[PDB]
Structures are given as structure tokens and as C-alpha cells.
Design a protein around this ligand. Structure first.
Ligand code: MET
Ligand SMILES: [Co+2]
Ligand SMILES: [Co+2]
Ligand code: NA
Length: 282
């Protein structure tokens, strides 16, 4: 199974005019980075809707993961599930991103662009979908095996899922935000994996990446305390090999230098009055 290279991008997928675009569509940058970290009750409930739709789109595209299928096809499926449910794919036209979801195979850490790339027996495929509806976003991702995946890789996927859900289970008001990345990095290190540091979770609400940063490694210098109504992602990328990476000429696709495989899972979370709610639960 050879190292991946860029395929052919299909043309921009249409979304019907009635679906509200986020403000940043067709602009070089987004108006984000200074929004409140705690959301209003109205926004939280809207985020439940956006989260459920993103989770649906993810599940639908994940069902299509099989050898012989293209990453473009995964994007077609996600895109149509979002549009059918009245949501705008938040990635489409976000800082020039050309598609409706991110498809990241094997050695691709993240941010792969759906294209003519064909999935083969034994690949692992991350699909990352974000929905924008009711003026809010919901952001979720998962890595799916394609055909007969090597034990080494099934384990990596299963343990990255598990790291993610363990971190989620620590979310509670009054707990330090830094606990998330301590729980993830401990679990990863237990099996000799390395957590990606340069890519992080993020606050999300009426804007996609609102300025709050959630680290996935141990960094106890962060002083942020979780507060009821805060909304953010937990989305650790976990590597078999070393952390070093390259970014393709496309400006998006991040690949391991050593070409060893890497997995990711993501949910959007709400800090409740006493614990956590997974907004992107199926
Ligand atoms: C296109 S920027 C990356 C978007 C991705 N859905 C994330 O989880 O932030
Ligand atoms: Co995402
Ligand atoms: Co995210
Ligand atoms: Na990967």
C-alpha cells in the first residue's frame, strides 16, 4: 500500500440558495476568534440541532467507506445529507477550503481534501463533517476501517476513540481544561503512541473556531476552568510514528513525514451545570 498523492478535485458542489451561508463564505478569512466561550441557552439548543445533523452526515458517509470508493464520493454523501437537512457544510468556502468535509486516509493526519482518491482494502479513513444551521455550528469526526485492516491499525483506531471518550468523560464545570489533554496523552503514551500537538480542539458556537483552544497533550500551564454553557471540541489526532509532518501544496493536507498511519475522533461538547453533553451524539 503506497504513500498517498493528490487526486482530481471534482467541481464545487452546489447548495441551494435558501440555506444560509456563514458569513465567511467566499471571503479569504472568517470573522471569528473573540466570541464568548459560554453560550446562551438559545445557542446551546440550536447547537443540539446542528450537532445531530453533523452526526448524521458523518454516520451516512461512514457507511459508504469500503474498498473501491472515492473520497469525493464520501463528500458527495455528506454534502447531500447536510443539504437535505437544511444545513450548510461549514467547511465549504471556509478559508478557501473547497469541499464539504475533510477526508484523511492513513498517513494523512488531518485536513485531507475529498478527491478521486480511491480507498483500498486495509485503509483507515477519517471523515470530518461540520454543519451550520440556525446560525451555529456542530463539528464531528471519526476514523472508519476499509475492508481487512491490520491489527496494528484497528488498535490505533479503537484506542484513539477510547482516548477521546475518556477525555469527554472528564468534562465538568470547575474542572481545569488542561485535564483533557492529560487524559488523552496518558492513554496514548500507554500504548506507545504520540499525540499531535500542533492541531487542537476549539471552541465552537456561532463561529467555527471561536478562539478557545483545547490542547490534546499535557500542558498544565493552561489556567482555563470549564464553566457551564461552554462549548468546544475534543478531537485528538494520534500517531503511530513521529510527530513531524509536511503540508501538501494544496495548503491543507497534513501528512506524517515517516508515513506511518494516524487516527482521529471528534465530538462537540457542552459543559452542563454538573457534567458534559455530547452534542454530536448520533
Ligand atoms: C477546514 S478547518 C478544519 C475543520 C474541522 N472540521 C475541525 O474539526 O476544525
Ligand atoms: Co471537525
Ligand atoms: Co473541530
Ligand atoms: Na490518518
Amino acid at each position: 500500500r503506497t504513500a498517498l498523492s493528490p487526486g482530481v478535485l471534482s467541481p464545487t458542489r452546489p447548495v441551494p440558495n435558501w440555506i444560509a451561508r456563514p458569513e465567511y463564505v467566499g471571503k479569504p478569512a472568517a470573522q471569528e476568534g473573540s466570541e464568548p466561550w459560554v453560550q446562551t441557552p438559545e445557542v446551546i439548543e440550536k447547537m443540539r440541532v446542528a450537532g445531530r445533523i453533523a452526526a448524521g452526515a458523518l454516520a451516512e458517509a461512514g457507511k459508504a467507506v469500503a474498498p473501491g470508493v472515492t473520497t469525493d464520493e464520501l463528500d458527495r454523501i455528506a454534502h447531500e445529507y447536510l443539504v437535505d437537512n437544511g444545513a450548510y457544510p461549514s467547511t465549504l468556502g471556509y478559508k478557501g477550503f473547497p469541499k464539504s468535509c475533510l477526508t484523511s486516509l492513513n498517513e494523512v493526519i488531518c485536513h485531507g481534501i475529498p478527491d478521486s482518491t480511491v480507498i483500498t482494502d486495509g485503509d483507515i479513513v477519517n471523515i470530518d463533517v461540520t454543519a451550520y444551521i440556525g446560525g451555529v455550528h456542530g463539528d464531528t469526526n471519526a476514523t472508519f476501517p476499509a475492508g481487512d485492516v491490520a491489527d496494528e491499525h484497528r488498535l490505533l483506531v479503537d484506542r484513539t476513540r477510547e482516548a477521546t471518550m475518556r477525555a469527554i468523560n472528564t468534562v465538568k464545570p470547575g474542572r481545569a481544561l488542561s485535564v483533557i489533554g492529560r487524559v488523552i496523552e496518558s492513554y496514548a503514551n500507554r500504548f506507545g503512541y504520540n499525540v499531535v500537538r500542533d492541531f487542537t480542539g476549539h471552541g465552537i458556537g456561532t463561529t467555527f473556531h471561536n478562539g478557545l483552544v483545547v490542547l490534546h497533550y499535557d500542558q498544565p500551564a493552561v489556567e482555563t476552568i470549564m464553566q457551564p454553557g461552554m462549548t468546544f471540541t475534543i478531537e485528538p489526532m494520534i500517531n503511530l510514528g513521529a510527530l513531524d509532518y509536511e503540508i501538501w501544496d494544496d495548503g491543507w493536507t497534513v501528512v506524517t513525514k515517516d508515513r506511518k498511519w494516524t487516527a482521529q475522533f471528534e465530538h462537540t461538547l457542552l459543559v452542563t451545570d454538573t457534567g458534559v453533553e455530547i452534542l454530536t451524539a448520533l
